[model samples]
Target: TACPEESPLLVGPMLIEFNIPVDLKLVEQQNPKVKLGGRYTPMDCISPHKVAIIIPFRNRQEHLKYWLYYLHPILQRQQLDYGIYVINQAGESMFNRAKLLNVGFKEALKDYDYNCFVFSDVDLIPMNDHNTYRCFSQPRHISVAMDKFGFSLPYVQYFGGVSALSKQQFLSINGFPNNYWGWGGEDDDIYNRLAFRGMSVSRPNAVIGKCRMIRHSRDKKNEPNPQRFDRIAHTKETMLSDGLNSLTYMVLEVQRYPLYTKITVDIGTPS
Candidate 1:
C-alpha cells in the first residue's frame, strides 16, 4: 500500500492550463489547512514515493509570496507524498546558491524520510502539472523549457531552474558544488558532477517541461562567482571532497509557513 495503484502519473499527466495571477491573499484563503514546517500526506491512498522539495533561497519575500501561491496547487495535484522546504540562507553573504541547496537536502531529511528530492528556485514556476516535479531514472531536469529562454533550452548542459533527483543519484554525485558562491556556475558544475559520476540528466521532453521564470534583476549581493571557470575546470580533481560530505552549517531557525517549512541557516562565508 506504499505505492500508487498504477505508476502512470510518474510519467507525464495531461495538464490543464491556467493563467496564474500573482495574488497572495487568494492563495492563503484556498490553502488554509497548510501549516509551516509541516508534513502532508494523502488521506485516501499511500503515495508511491516520498519527495522532499528543496528551494535554496535568500531575500526574495515578494517572490516567495507568489512562489508558494503557485506551487502548492500543482504539487497537490501531482499526487506526491511531499514536504516543501524553503532553505533560506542567513545573512547577506555571497549568496551561495549551491550550498543552500546542500543545506536544504540535509535539513529536509531531518524532518521526513524522503526518497526523492526536488531542488527548485523561488522565481520559477511550471506552466503545467505534467512537468511532474518528481525524480526519474536519472537526475531529472524538470524545467527543460523556460519562458526566460523563449520556451526553449539554451544548451544541452543547462541544468538550472527546477530539477529532481532520487536520493541515490544525488549521493552518487556528492551533491551540488558548495563553493559556487553565486549564480551561473553551480548548475553547470552540477551537470559536470553528475556526468563525472556516470549519471546523466533526464528530462520530461520539451513539451512537458515548460516553465515560467519570473523576471527580476539579479540580487544585490549575488555577483557572478569569478572562480566558476577554475572550479568547472577542476571538477574531477575536487568533486569527491567539496560536497555534502564536507558540508558544515547551523540551522538557525525553522518556521512553519502556511504552505511549507522555512529552514533558515547560517552557512558561513568563504575563508
Candidate 2:
C-alpha cells in the first residue's frame, strides 16, 4: 500500500490551549542548556566578552534584510557573545555614515560592557565563518575580499566594511573621525588612526576573508564628501579630538532583540 505523504496542515495537539503543566525538570534533562529565562550561557562565560555588531544604516531596507539573515547566523556560529545594533539617522541631512558609526559605538556602550565592537556596513556579507568576530591581538580588518572590488581589496588602507577593535585599541586611537560626513575618507582615517597609535592591522587569510557586497548605485546623499581625501591625509593630527571616543549624538530609540540589543541614534550633520 502506498502511504500518503505527511500533509503540511496536519494538526497536532494544541499545546497552548490546554494550559498544561510542563515538567521543566524533564525538559532540562533533555536539553541541559535550556533555561527559564531563555538565556543560553556559553561554556566560555568565565571570560566571555561581548561584541557589539554596530551597523550604521539609513533606508537600505533590502540590504538590511540580507545582512540580518546572513550575519546573525555567522556571529552565532563564531560563538561570539554579541548583539546587533542598527543606528539610524533620524532625518535626511546629507548622510554622515562615519559619524553614525561613531554614534553606534557611543550608544552601544551605555548599556553593556562590550569589550569589542565591529563597525560593519549593512551591504557587506561575509562568506566565510572562520573569520571570527573577536578582536585580535591587534586591530583586525575582517573584510578583505568583496565582489565589488573583484574579490580583492582595492588598496592597502581600505578599512571599510567589517572591522573589529578592542576597547583599549579603539580608545587609544580616539576612534573613527566623526567629521567624515559622507562616503570615503572615514575608513582611511581609521586606518591612519591605528597606525599613528602604533597598532598594526590584522586580517584573516584570503580563504577566510571572502565576502560579498550588495551592489547598488551610491545613495544620493552619500556622494563622495569633497574633503575626504584631504581628511584622510591629516587623520593623525586631527583624530585625538575628532574620532569615535569623543563623538556626540542623541539616542532616538532603543530596543531588544532575541539575541541582542539595538540602539538608534541621530548623529548631527558635519559642521
Candidate 3:
C-alpha cells in the first residue's frame, strides 16, 4: 500500500509519519495501555525487523539534528524497523565513544529483541539509500565515503563512521574497547576485534555508501587520547579480556521519536 501524502515515510499499518510530531495525547488515545511519559517505551506485536541504531553522542546537537533530518527519511524509505538511541555522556569528563556504544547496546536490548544494531556517529549522515541496514553474512561497514575525508577512505581498516552488527556478531567479539577514551583508536580496535574473531567486514560500493558529515570543530572533551595507537596495536591480544568484556556504564534516558528512539547513557571511567 502507498503511504499517505501527509506521511510518505510511514512503513507499517500503524500509519505513524516519520517527520510528523507525535502527539502524546493522540498516542494514548490510540492505545490506552501505553504509558505516555518515559525515557523508553516498549512496542510489541508490531513492526517487523527490529533494529537498534546506537549513536554515541556528547554535545554535537547540531550534528545530531542534521542526522535526524536526513537519515530518518532514508531509513523510512528503506522500510527498516529501527529505532535511534543517542547515548549521551553524563559529566564533563573525557569522552569515551566506544564505551558509550557498548552502553547503547546494553540499553537497547533491555526493551526489544533488536536483531540488528547500527553503531553510528551523530555527525555522519548517509547520502544514499542503497546501503541496507540489515545484518549480512559478515559484519557490515555501511559508511563507505564521507565528505569529511574528501569522500574517500584513508585506510583499508577504517571501519569508523557507521557500522552494523547482528546480535551474534557483536557478542562474539565481546564488543568495543572501553579504555580508548576520545575518538582515534576505538574504531580500529573494533575492526581488530572482528578480525581476530574470524569475522570479515562487509561494505557497499562507494556510490551506495556515500555520506556527509556536519562540519564542526572537534569537541573539547573529545581530544584524541595519546595512548590510542598503542592500545589499537595490541587489541588482538587484550580484546578477549581487556576490551569490551571489561566495560561498564549506566543508561540515563531512552526516548523514542516518531522514526527512531534515542538512548542516553553514562559510561563511567575505566576501573
Best by TM-score: 1
- In order of appearance, the predictions have TM-scores of 0.86, 0.76, 0.75
User: Which ten-residue region of model 3 has the weakest summed lDDT?
Assistant: 33-42
Candidate 1 residues lying further than 4 Å off, grouped into runs, are: 1-25, 32-38, 216-232
Residue-level lDDT tens digits of model 1 in 138-194: 999987887656677767777888899999999998987788776457787888888
Question: What is the lDDT of every predicted structure here?
Answer: 0.77, 0.68, 0.68
Which predicted model would earn the best lDDT?
A: 1
Candidate 2's error at 175, in angstroms?
Answer: 1.3
How would you order the candidates by lDDT, starting with the best?
1, 3, 2
Report the error of model 1 at residue 5, Å: 7.1
Clashes of each: 3, 0, 4
- The worst-scoring run of ten residues by lDDT in candidate 1 lies at 219-228
Clash list (residue pairs), candidate 1: 36-256, 36-257, 37-256
Clashing residue pairs, candidate 2? none
Model 2, residue 7: what's the lDDT?
23
